[PDB]
Ligand binder design. Structure first.
Ligand SMILES: Nc1ncnc2c1ncn2[C@@H]1O[C@H](COP(=O)(O)OP(=O)(O)OP(O)(O)=S)[C@@H](O)[C@H]1O
Ligand SMILES: Nc1ncnc2c1ncn2[C@@H]1O[C@H](COP(=O)(O)OP(=O)(O)OP(O)(O)=S)[C@@H](O)[C@H]1O
Ligand SMILES: [Mg+2]
Ligand SMILES: [Mg+2]
Ligand SMILES: [Zn+2]
Lengths: 432, 322, 432, 432
DNA sequence: GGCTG
DNA sequence: TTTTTTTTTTTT
């Protein structure tokens, strides 16, 4: 590994600028490698630039080495590699090499300290550190890392953090003006967002509308369905995207020509993403099967999603609980925690839906207290939008969206808003 | 399992291995070879710690260097799957000389009393009459090559004590040489005239009454009816007097192999000797004699009142364990 | 000097009473000495007295040992003999020998640790400490002297206790005088302090405000967030310390010039600590994870916190429990016990958050019987606080704190004090 | 060890008195040991006294054997020396030796019986017992020991039981007249006593008051704390003993002159014990840890406790059940049983505390069914008191200690009695 | 020159 | 991964 390290010190710039401050003579060897590194360090000190092979050989010629040292250094210099290895592997491997050598040196030093300690006090070296310095020395061996990034350091990462607030690095817009207004620019990555459906409110209509909106904005969407097949969910997606009514597809009003024309028109647009629909049996998909699905999609389909939409939280299974119940609070709390952990670890926006409490069903207003999942969903959910469908709203083709929990912004800023639900095309349109 | 086909497949697969040896006695199929898993000892290139046993119910391989033990099938599949598949398919497919001369040998009884080996045997305290069964040699390699040429590359002059092993007919069909020096390649180098030669000493000297099986022939000298199975594998069938023989092992209670052998003997319901009440505590009889001063008649007295068999032997063994 | 140690253990009452309680079997060797000490230790355990030669060589050595071990033990026992030596030199030489052997054992152990950690996973010999805890082993080996320090004698240790009283070397004062007049000087080092607020009532505004106050007081603060990213928590801290509304940093009413100016104005102050924010997925961090994080911070960033703020106690996991339990009582109690053990081990004030029961939602008063996850959590906490701002305090930007459990003082003295919340700046101000 | 047995039979006297009745010639050997024991037994039968070495030589001379063994016997009596070994070890080793030899003889006898049964009746021995006698004689070898007492007999041992009534030898007074009245002499040794109360009610306060009262009655009190630090418990004890409020210590209203003066005034008392306060991590100590602590306390100092105050048993761990293998009931029952076993082994009064259920935290009356964790803890306890505090009681500095369980007296004579509680001084006072 | 489970 | 006892706890 030392040959590679020296070669990419000589014949690279980013690697040099990254690993030079953490490079010491004692890390290499007691033979040709140490002499070569001493030549490199001397040249960089006298001339603040990376030496070339000819300059290195000139320095070796004008240097004080014996015959064996001269031969070793000459052979090593003639054995340098200009191969362009990948940067990440090179940095990680040289970090591991440096750490191993530092640990070996520290262990040898503490062994020598102990050996010197067990010697006649009249007869010992004064320069050798005392035994009490042993725990600190090993610490200096363990404090060797090319790059230190343990968490977010306030007052040490304020310039990077400001670039996050200006660039809105975490926000993902909604394509609906009202939803962008109440989220201060959309939902955030690594979040769990749920919709609470009361009486006459399907849970998959809103999820399909969000999936279509994200698809039109260029995002990779992974729709995991539980109670429905892949074809049915993709048919809801087609209804929303192709403007064809859902019943028109089953009846046969729309022909193959119009369908293919609309699909190719969408394919021509470069602002379109990819939608992958995966079906799982009811209760047969915990938030560990989703990790395997993501791994398979990344490896085989190269599909790395930014939006993950689960059809229904209640139908899912808690991996931690193992035992499954049709409508149990402990499972819903665990499922929410597991899904939010998946969202955080995958840096994706995760969407799901739940049913509101029966009292919430009868009452147009839904309270966090009036929720089927109490203290379990309004504790692990960054955003919880509530959807109300009464008779008067249904007659006007509308649904009252109420904001029950908003980690993003103030919940009471714009709490109630009317949404233009179309149940045929499975779409949400704004209301002026 | 199928021992013969596994032995054949192991033979085919390990024919090319380093130090490969066909260590196959009259009843066992063992293969000695340098362990390809670890190369055996890095220091010793002549070590062959890879051993395959076909005598076992399933031919199993084991290395004494890397301590890797497995069935033959596991090694075959993990190292040679090509022949492994053929083997696993085949699984359901099947579904005498007598020594007459003693060159460079002078019998101890006729040896000079001033010979240093005579002094050593006096330190060994051997009965004087027994010397008529032991010879001394200065050219043990020379003598062996004279009788069995090619045994020794060089016929170095080595003085040893040669005990010829006489059959029931009294015919020396083998001989054991004890090196006089404390340092030797082996304390007891035993060479037989023919491979089927008797492994039991003193058979020609067996008298009436119980027969005492001991470890060393020299130990048997102090004992009337003292026979000595001269090394080898302990086999009851090859041992005569199966009715009346008496087992006498060494006095090493903490030693595990000794107690293992004694357990094996008692489980066969044999009649064994116990030292759990011996006044002397040396390892063997000769050590008690030379050190504790044990005298043979006391030894016989103790042994005739310490032989146990069956459940008596088993219970007296339990205490003698440790 | 094993022979002398054993001989004066057998044949000296004063030496025995002085040195026996500090004797261990891992000090002598891997041969006859260890077996002889095993016999002596077994005899002392069984009969509470020093064995004699007869007991050693008959009652104990006549047990179970191989031939070589038996011969070695017999020779060593026969070699034991009483020798006239001063009982100040014997104790000092024995102490030096024990210290040397402890250092040797520690060096061998850390060598084995490095060798094990160098190996790839699936063969890494679990339960063996990581490379991070090398220096603590050496430090423990250093302090292996023969000093009697078992507990705190009441009459023999009143000087150190009075020094602790006068120095007050347990209190960490708040920046709020109201929280200092009820805690009699602030929270204590080895303690677990809890906030209970509900859903979207606080419970992280309070934790962020406490972190900001501790930062202004020069303390090193470690904010481990399970429900929010590092950037959002740091944004709340920025809103608290820069006197800028949380919405202003999102809409864009604050320029980069004034942001950098305020940050540099805070930097130049010597009375400012370091705040490090680290995020973990919801339900994927235990006390062992926190210990690993602390070790990593100490080694790499040289960061040893005095305040540890876990954003939520109930969405962590138990290190001791191996199989997830649907019973929230045992899991939350175990998590709280592990967190308090970590706090008392690191001598760090540990603040966390707890969820109140749905009954307490929109309730003008919250009792201790309103704790949601577990009733064992209030038993392990050293100080709990409840936030009960229902409807009218929100209109007045107020929050009422009840002081449900107070181990620093009488909770019935100043039960309510009506804290001045500010949600835009995410801070608490008094009503002085 | 036949040499030791014979030597201590000839020379030692108390050993002879204890071991001679359980001695038979069949236990020794069939050689010199048997002959020597036969000579000793014949001499003791002739003259009812232990013989001497010269007497043994005379007996050998007049009563002769065959010289073969006679030489072995005369060389056997050349090593019997005084060798003043400890009595307990000698008795235990002799008992083990005779038990082993009895087992060997019984096995040999049953083997001989089986061999005789196989023989034809014509030549079979008549003295040997039948096969049907094999079990019972084996039992005769199983129940061989030096314990002359197998249990307690009501009529035979009426004496030595009246002694336990005149001198209590179990009662430890309480220093409080009400507790002595309801206990009829105080808590007994080898017992488990529990104070049960809600969270933040006074349990540690009561335990510290009891520890202070015991300390004033010349008792060795060991306070083991699983939650609070040693300094906090010592501060409670100082507040109780030095008549200084807790607020005074944390407000600096007491000078070092007063503190040291009061401490030395307490030291000058000859009626003061020792109070060692030991801290363990929550859930990180068991009964065996307590036994190790007691052993090291006895070794490293002259401290053998008579009172052991465990702060809370619920936060300990069982030394038999693996961690979190069983539910709360089984684990807490096992912990209580282990603590009571420790108490009966050490002959100490063990006080502890337990939590009540969530339903009893705001109740004016506490029943035995309100115990948290196991219901087997009341079964295992010997004396249980319930501490009840309400608003009216807190307004008068009083509590409502109620007898839940009493093995010391009738719980109905004085079931509920008010007790003044000075929380500032952490002291229990009795209303008079 | 043998020795494994 | 189910099954059954008992307990303790909590949520509705
Ligand atoms: N960006 C924001 N702008 C203004 N107010 C906010 C913002 N984020 C949160 N809040 C307010 O802060 C409170 C929310 O409490 P937090 O400190 O976020 O913790 P929490 O939400 O109570 O914890 P949970 O488990 O998510 S309910 C509410 O009063 C919100 O109105
Ligand atoms: N450090 C302290 N300073 C002042 N008062 C205290 C202190 N500790 C306890 N008290 C008072 O004494 C009461 C009982 O405290 P303890 O007896 O220690 O409690 P406990 O029974 O151990 O239960 P916890 O630990 O509080 S759940 C408290 O409610 C306070 O009124
Ligand atoms: Mg929060
Ligand atoms: Mg307490
Ligand atoms: Zn090998």
């Amino acid at each position: 590994m030392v040959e590679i390290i020296l070669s990419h010190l000589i014949f690279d710039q980013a690697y040099f600028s990254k690993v030079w401050p953490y490079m010491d003579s004692e890390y290499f060897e007691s033979g040709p490698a140490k002499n070569t590194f001493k030549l490199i360090k001397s040249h960089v000190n006298e001339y603040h630039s990376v030496p070339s092979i000819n300059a290195l050989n000139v320095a070796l010629e004008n240097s004080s080495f014996t015959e064996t040292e001269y031969s070793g250094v000459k052979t090593l210099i003639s054995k340098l590699a200009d191969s362009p290895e990948d940067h990440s592997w090179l940095v990680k491997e040289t970090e591991k090499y440096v750490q191993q050598r530092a640990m070996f040196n520290a262990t040898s030093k503490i062994i020598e300290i102990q050996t010197n300690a067990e010697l006649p006090p009249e007869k010992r070296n004064k320069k050798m550190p005392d035994v009490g310095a042993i725990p600190d020395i090993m610490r200096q061996a363990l404090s060797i890392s090319f790059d230190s990034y343990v968490g977010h350091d306030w007052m040490d990462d304020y310039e990077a953090r400001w670039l996050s607030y200006m660039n809105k690095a975490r926000k993902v817009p909604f394509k609906l003006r009202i939803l962008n207004k109440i989220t201060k620019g959309g939902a955030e990555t690594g979040t769990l967002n749920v919709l609470m459906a009361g009486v006459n409110v399907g849970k998959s209509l809103g999820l399909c509308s969000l999936a279509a909106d994200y698809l039109q904005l260029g995002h990779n969407v992974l729709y995991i369905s539980m109670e429905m097949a892949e074809e049915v969910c993709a048919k809801r997606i087609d209804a929303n995207m192709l403007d064809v009514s859902l019943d028109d597809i089953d009846d046969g009003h729309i022909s193959y020509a119009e369908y293919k024309g609309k699909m190719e028109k969408w394919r021509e647009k470069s602002t379109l993403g990819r939608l992958i629909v995966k079906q799982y049996p009811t209760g047969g998909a915990d938030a560990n099967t989703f990790r395997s699905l993501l791994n398979e999609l990344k490896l085989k389909k190269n599909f790395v999603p930014t939006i993950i939409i689960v059809d229904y939280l209640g139908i899912c299974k808690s991996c931690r609980i193992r035992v499954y119940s049709e409508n149990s609070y402990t499972t819903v709390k665990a499922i929410a925690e597991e899904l939010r952990a998946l969202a955080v670890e995958t840096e994706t926006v995760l969407w799901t839906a739940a049913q509101v409490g029966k009292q919430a069903w009868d009452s147009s207003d839904v309270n966090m207290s009036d929720i089927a999942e109490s203290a379990g969903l309004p504790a692990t959910a960054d955003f919880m939008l509530a959807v109300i469908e009464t008779e008067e709203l249904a007659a006007a083709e509308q649904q009252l969206i109420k904001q029950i929990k908003s980690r993003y912004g103030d919940k009471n800023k714009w709490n109630k808003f009317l949404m233009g639900v179309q149940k045929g095309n499975q779409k949400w349109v704004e209301i002026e | 399992s199928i021992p013969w086909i596994d032995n054949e497949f192991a033979y085919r697969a390990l024919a090319h291995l380093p130090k490969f040896t066909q260590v196959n006695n009259s009843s066992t199929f063992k293969l000695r070879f340098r362990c390809p898993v670890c190369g055996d000892s890095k220091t010793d290139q002549n070590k062959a710690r890879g051993w395959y046993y076909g005598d076992n119910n399933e031919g199993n391989i084991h290395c004494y260097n890397c301590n890797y033990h497995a069935p033959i099938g596991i090694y075959l599949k993990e190292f040679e799957p090509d022949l492994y598949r053929e083997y696993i398919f085949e699984i359901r497919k099947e579904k005498k000389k007598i020594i007459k001369s003693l060159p460079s040998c002078v019998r101890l009884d006729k040896l000079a009393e001033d010979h240093p080996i005579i002094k050593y045997v006096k330190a060994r305290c051997i009965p004087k009459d027994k010397w008529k069964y032991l010879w001394f040699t200065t050219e043990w390699p020379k003598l062996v090559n004279s009788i069995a040429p090619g045994t020794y590359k060089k016929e170095i002059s080595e003085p040893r004590l040669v005990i010829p092993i006489y059959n029931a007919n009294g015919k020396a069909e083998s001989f054991q040489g004890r090196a006089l020096k404390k340092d030797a390649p082996q304390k007891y180098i035993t060479i037989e005239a023919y491979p089927e030669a008797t492994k039991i000493y003193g058979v020609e000297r067996v008298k009436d009454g119980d027969v005492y099986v001991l470890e060393g022939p020299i130990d048997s000298l102090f004992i009337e009816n003292g026979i000595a199975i001269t090394g080898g594998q302990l086999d009851l069938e090859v041992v005569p007097f199966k009715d009346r023989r008496v087992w006498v092992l060494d006095n090493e209670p903490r030693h595990p192999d000794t107690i293992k052998r004694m357990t094996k003997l008692v489980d066969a319901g044999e009649r064994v000797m116990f030292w759990d009440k011996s006044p002397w505590k040396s390892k063997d009889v000769n050590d008690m004699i030379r050190k504790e001063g044990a005298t043979p008649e006391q030894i016989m007295e103790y042994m005739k009142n310490n032989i146990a068999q069956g459940l008596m032997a088993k219970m007296r063994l339990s205490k003698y364990a440790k």
